[PDB]
Amino acid sequence: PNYKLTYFNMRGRAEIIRYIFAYLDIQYEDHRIEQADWPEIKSTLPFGKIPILEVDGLTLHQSLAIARYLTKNTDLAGNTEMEQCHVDAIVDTLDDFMSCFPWAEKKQDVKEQMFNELLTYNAPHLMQDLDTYLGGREWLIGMSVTWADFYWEICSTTLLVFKPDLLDNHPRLVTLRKKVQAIPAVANWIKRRPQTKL
Amino acid sequence: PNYKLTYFNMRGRAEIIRYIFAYLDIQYEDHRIEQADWPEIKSTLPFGKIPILEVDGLTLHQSLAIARYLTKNTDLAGNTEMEQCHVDAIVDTLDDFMSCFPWAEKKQDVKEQMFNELLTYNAPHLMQDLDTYLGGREWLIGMSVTWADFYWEICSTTLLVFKPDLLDNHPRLVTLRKKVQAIPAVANWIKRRPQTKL
């Protein structure tokens, strides 16, 4: 089928979709719009938000809903229904935290303060719960990589931009990132993708 | 299987699970804890949040992950993988919005300010997007009820508590709420459930 992903020129919420396409070796149009075209693009979105993924003429929206759709019947989904639930749960827990940041906050002064408070007073609790959850296991769910691992690597990459020492107390979570970054197809995408801050 | 749902004494985030159980005619323990006992239970949870669902001893978390698990392979999921994606997307759009409200904000000043902002400016836009998405169809996705319809009913019920005129310009969205409440199993639950504000 023909796929067309539309998002801004940044990793952000479209990156999980881009990782999945890379991993599954599926061709797609990576459409990155500029701020100047937002007004026009927006008037075509079902709920005024991106990313959207057009599949053979039909529009899908919501990054995680799209990620789940693309991984259905693949090795990234989770081996059992219980495990698939755990994958969804970990992704939503991560997404819940990322959604707490004031990404659209105009006033930089207030924005910086909130980011710093979230990374100092809240992040540590989530990092510890994730580390405890993973224990000595190779991956977050099951005995093989799932898109939950992809999401951890993606979210942590952005958090590290604002809090470099985020994982200084959790080497096991760093190892996990490295294992994700070591997957051949993923490594290739990470090396070739457009370099953006977020 | 043996199901035990744990949450606070309110509809909130556990209600979608309660609707699914009622619709599917599944018995479960509806455990509603007291604030005074939350800090004790919280310490035993991998991620310290509720609702959680114990399935034959195994614990699951994240309301939507659990809802998806329960509806898999049932008539409440979409009829195709694409339709299943639409269901997931609608639920996430609604959840994203409801999650924007500062429910735990102690500062009545900031809390009231954000509630008014969300209800006065954002809500109308979402309502218009939803009405347009629904069009003249009976349900949000496909030709039959899905858990996305349940979620609309649940979400709008709480929104209507703070903004009763929410749907005065959207009769079709009111009718959808009524269509869901009319389903025998749901109507039975609605009339039997604990009467709470949220």
Ligand SMILES: N[C@@H](CCC(=O)N[C@@H](CS)C(=O)NCC(=O)O)C(=O)O
């Ligand atoms: N939870 C949604 C997020 C939707 C969202 O807020 N997208 C942002 C881009 S990162 C956007 O479209 N913003 C436009 C706006 O805020 O009006 C997803 O994962 O797709």
Ligand SMILES: N[C@@H](CCC(=O)N[C@@H](CS)C(=O)NCC(=O)O)C(=O)O
């Ligand atoms: N996004 C999670 C909700 C996590 C959450 O914030 N739950 C609230 C109850 S509505 C709770 O656990 N708050 C008590 C606390 O965080 O200590 C889900 O959908 O289950």
Ligand SMILES: [Mg+2]
């Ligand atoms: Mg979410």
